[PDB]
């Protein structure tokens, strides 16, 4: 629920870590729709199956799980081997540990139709190969990743992945957004309050609080006499609360006695109105 685009998003996130001498590498995969996790897979888990993590995804037949469980496992084998292929490209030993991550997914517009596609890899936290935003060309950072870029241009991989991205990918995302309407299309506006902690009798930290909102996209801003005090405002990363919502605060350092010249502003999708909060 991209407030700028009208768009929703499906994303899968995959992390594989090699364990020299402690068994085959560990594969963790998670799927999200917008800001809701709905699916998970742990190679070290006993179930050895794709597992639900959202209540609306349990409404799914056996052929769904047998088939998703099949693909995610096919993925684990394929990135395990790529850990060796990549280790051989950079001329490094089997003694040290390495992290290979993947991400792929698609975005739907307000139209309900395909808008955006993603298919990206990253070795040891550093962008390795990536499908350009047009889905017709690749980007390779290392010289080593360019070996894959020509092998994949010569195997015509971009066209088929675009088929998954314009195909199953948008179809899955549309179906999830309907099945979990009461979750994914329902906006939780933030609860707003603010607090005063005197740091001296000279100065003072004024903190604006937003709790229990969804989606996680939010904007908090401070204003002195109606000007943005971007400088002296402290902003924390949006954080998860565990109930499916998110929290975020903004605090500014204010001369004591002038608290009323300071205004807090909350822009969030779940408000029919940007809020204004005074200390008052």
């Amino acid at each position: 629920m991209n407030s700028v685009d009208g768009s929703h998003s499906m994303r899968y996130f995959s992390t594989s870590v090699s364990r020299p001498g402690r068994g085959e590498p560990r594969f963790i995969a998670v799927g999200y729709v917008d800001d809701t996790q709905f699916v998970r897979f742990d190679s070290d888990a006993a179930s050895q199956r794709m597992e639900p993590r959202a209540p609306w995804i349990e409404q799914e037949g056996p052929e769904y799980w047998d088939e998703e469980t099949g693909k995610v496992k096919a993925h684990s084998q394929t990135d395990r081997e790529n850990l060796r292929i990549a280790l051989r490209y950079y001329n490094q030993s089997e003694a040290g540990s390495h992290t290979l991550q993947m991400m792929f997914g698609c975005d739907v517009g307000s139209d309900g139709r395909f808008l955006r596609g993603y298919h990206q890899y990253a070795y040891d936290g550093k962008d390795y190969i990536a499908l350009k935003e047009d889905l017709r060309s690749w980007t390779a950072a290392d010289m080593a990743a360019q070996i894959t870029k020509r092998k994949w241009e010569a195997a015509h991989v971009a066209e088929q992945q675009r088929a998954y991205l314009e195909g199953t990918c948008v179809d899955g995302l549309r179906r999830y957004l309907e099945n979990g309407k009461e979750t994914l299309q329902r906006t939780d506006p933030p609860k707003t309050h603010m607090t005063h902690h005197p740091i001296s009798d000279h100065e003072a930290t004024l903190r604006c609080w937003a709790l229990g909102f969804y989606p996680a996209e939010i904007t908090l801003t401070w204003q002195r006499d109606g000007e943005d005090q971007t400088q002296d405002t402290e902003l924390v990363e949006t954080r998860p609360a565990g109930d499916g919502t998110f929290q975020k605060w903004a605090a500014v350092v204010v001369p004591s006695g002038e608290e009323q010249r300071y205004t807090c502003h909350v822009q969030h999708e779940g408000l029919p109105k940007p809020l204004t909060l005074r200390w008052e």
């Binding site: 995610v72 096919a74 993925h75 292929i85 990549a86 092998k151 991989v157 998954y164 199953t168």
Partner: peptide, 9 residues
Amino acid sequence: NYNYLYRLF
């Protein structure tokens, strides 16, 4: 709906 195309480096 997970990806179904798997390729080597």
